[PDB]
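Purpose: get a first structural picture of the assembly so the mutagenesis plan has something to point at.
Setup: 102 entries, given in the order below. No constraints added.
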Amino acid sequence: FLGALFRALSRLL
Amino acid sequence: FLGALFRALSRLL
Amino acid sequence: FLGALFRALSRLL
Amino acid sequence: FLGALFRALSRLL
Amino acid sequence: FLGALFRALSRLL
Amino acid sequence: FLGALFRALSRLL
Amino acid sequence: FLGALFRALSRLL
Amino acid sequence: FLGALFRALSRLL
Amino acid sequence: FLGALFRALSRLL
Amino acid sequence: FLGALFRALSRLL
Amino acid sequence: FLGALFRALSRLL
Amino acid sequence: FLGALFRALSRLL
Amino acid sequence: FLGALFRALSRLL
Amino acid sequence: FLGALFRALSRLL
Amino acid sequence: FLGALFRALSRLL
Amino acid sequence: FLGALFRALSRLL
Amino acid sequence: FLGALFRALSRLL
Amino acid sequence: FLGALFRALSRLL
Amino acid sequence: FLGALFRALSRLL
Amino acid sequence: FLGALFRALSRLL
Amino acid sequence: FLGALFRALSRLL
Amino acid sequence: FLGALFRALSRLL
Amino acid sequence: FLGALFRALSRLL
Amino acid sequence: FLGALFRALSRLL
Amino acid sequence: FLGALFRALSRLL
Amino acid sequence: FLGALFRALSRLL
Amino acid sequence: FLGALFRALSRLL
Amino acid sequence: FLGALFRALSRLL
Amino acid sequence: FLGALFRALSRLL
Amino acid sequence: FLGALFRALSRLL
Amino acid sequence: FLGALFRALSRLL
Amino acid sequence: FLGALFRALSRLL
Amino acid sequence: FLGALFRALSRLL
Amino acid sequence: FLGALFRALSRLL
Amino acid sequence: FLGALFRALSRLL
Amino acid sequence: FLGALFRALSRLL
Amino acid sequence: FLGALFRALSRLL
Amino acid sequence: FLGALFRALSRLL
Amino acid sequence: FLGALFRALSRLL
Amino acid sequence: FLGALFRALSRLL
Amino acid sequence: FLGALFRALSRLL
Amino acid sequence: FLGALFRALSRLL
Amino acid sequence: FLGALFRALSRLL
Amino acid sequence: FLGALFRALSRLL
Amino acid sequence: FLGALFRALSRLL
Amino acid sequence: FLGALFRALSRLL
Amino acid sequence: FLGALFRALSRLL
Amino acid sequence: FLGALFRALSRLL
Amino acid sequence: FLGALFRALSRLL
Amino acid sequence: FLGALFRALSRLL
Amino acid sequence: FLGALFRALSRLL
Amino acid sequence: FLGALFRALSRLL
Amino acid sequence: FLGALFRALSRLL
Amino acid sequence: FLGALFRALSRLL
Amino acid sequence: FLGALFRALSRLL
Amino acid sequence: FLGALFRALSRLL
Amino acid sequence: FLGALFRALSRLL
Amino acid sequence: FLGALFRALSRLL
Amino acid sequence: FLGALFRALSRLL
Amino acid sequence: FLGALFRALSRLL
Amino acid sequence: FLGALFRALSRLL
Amino acid sequence: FLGALFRALSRLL
Amino acid sequence: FLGALFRALSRLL
Amino acid sequence: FLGALFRALSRLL
Amino acid sequence: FLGALFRALSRLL
Amino acid sequence: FLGALFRALSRLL
Amino acid sequence: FLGALFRALSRLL
Amino acid sequence: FLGALFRALSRLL
Amino acid sequence: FLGALFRALSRLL
Amino acid sequence: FLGALFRALSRLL
Amino acid sequence: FLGALFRALSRLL
Amino acid sequence: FLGALFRALSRLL
Amino acid sequence: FLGALFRALSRLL
Amino acid sequence: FLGALFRALSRLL
Amino acid sequence: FLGALFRALSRLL
Amino acid sequence: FLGALFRALSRLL
Amino acid sequence: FLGALFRALSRLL
Amino acid sequence: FLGALFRALSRLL
Amino acid sequence: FLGALFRALSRLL
Amino acid sequence: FLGALFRALSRLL
Amino acid sequence: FLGALFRALSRLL
Amino acid sequence: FLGALFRALSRLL
Amino acid sequence: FLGALFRALSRLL
Amino acid sequence: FLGALFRALSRLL
Amino acid sequence: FLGALFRALSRLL
Amino acid sequence: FLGALFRALSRLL
Amino acid sequence: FLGALFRALSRLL
Amino acid sequence: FLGALFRALSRLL
Amino acid sequence: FLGALFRALSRLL
Amino acid sequence: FLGALFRALSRLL
Amino acid sequence: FLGALFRALSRLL
Amino acid sequence: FLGALFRALSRLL
Amino acid sequence: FLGALFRALSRLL
Amino acid sequence: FLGALFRALSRLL
Amino acid sequence: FLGALFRALSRLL
Amino acid sequence: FLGALFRALSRLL
Amino acid sequence: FLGALFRALSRLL
Amino acid sequence: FLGALFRALSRLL
Amino acid sequence: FLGALFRALSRLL
Amino acid sequence: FLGALFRALSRLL
Amino acid sequence: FLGALFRALSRLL
Amino acid sequence: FLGALFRALSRLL
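Result (structure tokens, whole complex):
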């Protein structure tokens, strides 16, 4: 989950 | 850069 | 941006 | 529910 | 804005 | 009830 | 304001 | 009673 | 209320 | 100017 | 000025 | 009461 | 001044 | 009592 | 909301 | 210029 | 001064 | 007693 | 997002 | 120049 | 208020 | 001149 | 002059 | 009070 | 606003 | 000249 | 001068 | 008290 | 923007 | 000359 | 203003 | 001559 | 002459 | 004020 | 000092 | 006893 | 002269 | 005060 | 502008 | 001559 | 001086 | 005590 | 002024 | 002659 | 783990 | 201007 | 002759 | 990353 | 350099 | 030169 | 003569 | 003042 | 002179 | 104090 | 960029 | 010459 | 000095 | 004890 | 540019 | 000659 | 003469 | 003072 | 020094 | 014990 | 150093 | 045990 | 480091 | 067990 | 460990 | 130098 | 002189 | 103390 | 590293 | 020279 | 003479 | 002091 | 670099 | 000559 | 320890 | 010098 | 001198 | 201690 | 360049 | 001759 | 170190 | 000379 | 002379 | 000290 | 130290 | 001379 | 270096 | 001569 | 160089 | 002769 | 050094 | 002569 | 010193 | 004569 | 001094 | 005569 | 003074 | 005659 969170944040920022 | 940083952090955690 | 951030955060949780 | 909360927050903010 | 925030939060809960 | 509370708070504030 | 807030709270409860 | 108490408090404050 | 506050402050300043 | 700024800010919030 | 500000604030609250 | 407080403070300052 | 401020505060409370 | 306290404080300061 | 705020500020300044 | 800057910033956020 | 302050506080309580 | 305490404290300080 | 911000600022300035 | 500078900085970050 | 300040300053200077 | 400058500045703000 | 300046500032505030 | 302060300062300077 | 400021300054100077 | 300079600067900003 | 300034400030406070 | 402080300071300075 | 500024300055001077 | 200088400088930046 | 200054200087000199 | 020089300079600026 | 120059300068500013 | 200053200087010089 | 403080407090209790 | 304790504490500290 | 200059300057300020 | 200062300076110089 | 200045100076001299 | 000189210098700059 | 200042401050407190 | 402290400090400094 | 100066010089010499 | 020369020079300037 | 973190950060930055 | 000067000198001499 | 010389010199310059 | 930043800056400047 | 610094820090920890 | 300087600084860091 | 010259120059300035 | 100076110089020379 | 200046300045402050 | 300072400085200089 | 700047300056001057 | 100087300086930097 | 200060402070406490 | 502490500190410092 | 300036001067002189 | 000189100097620079 | 000159200049200033 | 200076200089020279 | 300070503190406690 | 601790720390530091 | 500190602390406890 | 703990910590750090 | 710390801490416990 | 826990934690972190 | 850290930093810098 | 500084610091700690 | 100045300053403070 | 400091400084300089 | 930096700068400059 | 200076400075640090 | 001049200047200042 | 300085200079020169 | 600069300047001048 | 001077200066630096 | 630190720093610097 | 300074400071602390 | 200054300062503190 | 510090510094400087 | 200048001057004169 | 002189001078420089 | 720096600088300059 | 100066300065520091 | 001047200046200061 | 400085300078010059 | 500095500078210059 | 000056200055400081 | 500079200048001039 | 002068100056510095 | 100059001048004259 | 004179002057310089 | 400089100048002239 | 002059001047300085 | 200079000049001339 | 003049001038200064 | 100078000059000439 | 002239001039100044 | 100078010159010639 | 001339010139000036 946490990895998914940071992947989504990267894809966003 | 920033995106790569967060993606690396994701793959790490 | 901010709206997209909150929307992605929703889709995550 | 929480996803709905954050979606409403995104739609608002 | 703020009134809309509380109104949406009402409609949520 | 709670929805009514937040609606009244919105209408006020 | 404060008076109106407390009066609305009374009418509510 | 409780509504009366809050009404008196509003009338006071 | 907040809107009234800022309107009064505008009328003042 | 300042009055218009605060009035617009009022209508916003 | 200051007196007017505080008096307006009083009539508000 | 609070309105009286701010009115007195205005009258003073 | 200060004496008047505290005296007014006393007469208030 | 509290009024007496603040009156004494005013008379002092 | 935030977009509306900055649009109003742009229209103003 | 300034208005265009703030408007672009709005459309961004 | 300080002695007078504490003495007045004593006579109060 | 308390008055005596504060009187002694005044006489000391 | 950040890249979009700097691209918009470049297009502007 | 300046626009190209900010555009390059965008593509970097 | 501010307009009054600058008008008074103009009338003076 | 100076008075006119300050007066126009007042009418602006 | 200076006295008139401070007096006008007094009547303003 | 503040007006009295500035009036006294004017009378002095 | 800023454009109005500079237009007024132009008209003046 | 100077007036035209400031007017052009206004229309720019 | 200075003594008169501090004395007036005393009579004020 | 405070008035006494500033009176003593005036008498000194 | 900057290019527009310098072009306007050229056209003027 | 001067106009051409500023125009070329614009075309550069 | 500046034009008025130079016109007055011309009429004088 | 001199007056005409200053007048022309006025009409220029 | 000199007096007239300074007087004209006064009436200007 | 400034006009009065320059008028006094004219009357003097 | 401290010794006197504790000694007085002793005689008090 | 308590008086003795505080007296000894005074004698110590 | 000089004395008159400073005296007039005093009478002004 | 300032007027007194400049008057004394005039009387001296 | 500069060309206009030098043309006016030419027509004058 | 001189007029032609300044005129040519204008046409250049 | 300094000694007198501290002595007066002592006698005050 | 405090008065003694400041008296000793005065005697020292 | 200059014309007056040279006319006076003519009348004199 | 000389007077006429200086008079003509005045009429010129 | 931590060694992996700093190695990845080195590889990146 | 210079032509007028030399023509006046001619008509004089 | 001399008048013609100066006249021709004017027509030249 | 930093090396890439400075390489791009070099390529630009 | 920087990358080597972080790599050395990694091998340390 | 400047480009070479920045490129060398890049290869260093 | 010389006295008359200086007197005329006085009446002028 | 200046006129008085030159009148004194005339009277003297 | 200088002594008188400083003495008068003393009598002022 | 300050008056004493300047009196001593006068008596010295 | 800098090379382009100096080349443009050369082509101009 | 000058153009060649600036061109060589460009090719250098 | 410092030693005397601490010694006096000791004898005080 | 505390007095001994400060005495030792004085003896040391 | 400079060549054009000197060519114009040549053509003129 | 002179024209040829300035023309040659132009062709040089 | 010279003495009279300096004396007159004294009575002037 | 200045008058005294010039009177002494006159009496000397 | 530091060693002596800590040793004295030891002998104290 | 505590004295031993401070002695050891002194011996160390 | 640090190792010695912890070792001494161990031997102490 | 605790001594062993601090010895191990010393040996490590 | 951290690994060694936890390993030694394990071996100890 | 606990030693095994910390060994595993070391091996992990 | 700390000694190793500083040795590595020395070897690096 | 710097390396020797850090190495000496290491051997110290 | 300097010694006397510092001595008087001592006697003052 | 301060007086002693300045006396020693005077005796020195 | 620092030595390498200065060597590269030397090789460059 | 300069290169040798920087190289020597490198070998030093 | 010179000595008398400096002596008079002394008695004046 | 200054008077003494100029008296000594007079006595010398 | 600097050597190249001065060589280019030599080749040019 | 000049070229040789600059070339030798290059070979020096 | 601290003495050793400063001795090493002395030996180094 | 510097080494001696730090060594003396070491022997002090 | 400097040594005497610091020694006197030592004997003071 | 402090006296020893300043004595050592005096002996050094 | 300089040689070319002097050769052109030779060819011209 | 003169041409030969300038030509040889060019050949020199 | 510092001595080595200045020795190297001497050897260089 | 210069080398000897820097060498002596090194030997001193 | 010069020696006497400096000696008298010493005796004065 | 200063007197000694100027006496030595006198004895030297 | 400073005496040694100036002695070395004397010996050198 | 110069050496003697610096030597005496050393002997002073 | 400086000696080499002056030797090169010697051989050149 | 000149070459010998610069060579000797080199050998000096 | 200078010798070459004078030899060329000799050969020419 | 003249050529020989300049040749001799060359060989001397 | 300076003596050596002037001796070399003597020997050379 | 001249050599003797510079030699004696060196012997002096 | 100066006397020695002029005596040497006398002996020489 | 001249030697006697310079010798007497030395004996004077 | 000046009188002594002129008396010596008289005695000499 | 001449000696008497200079002697009288000395007695005068 | 000047009158005395001319009278002395009169009595001499 | 001459003496009378200079005497009259004195009585005038």
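Chains AN and CM do not touch (no CB pair under 8 Å).
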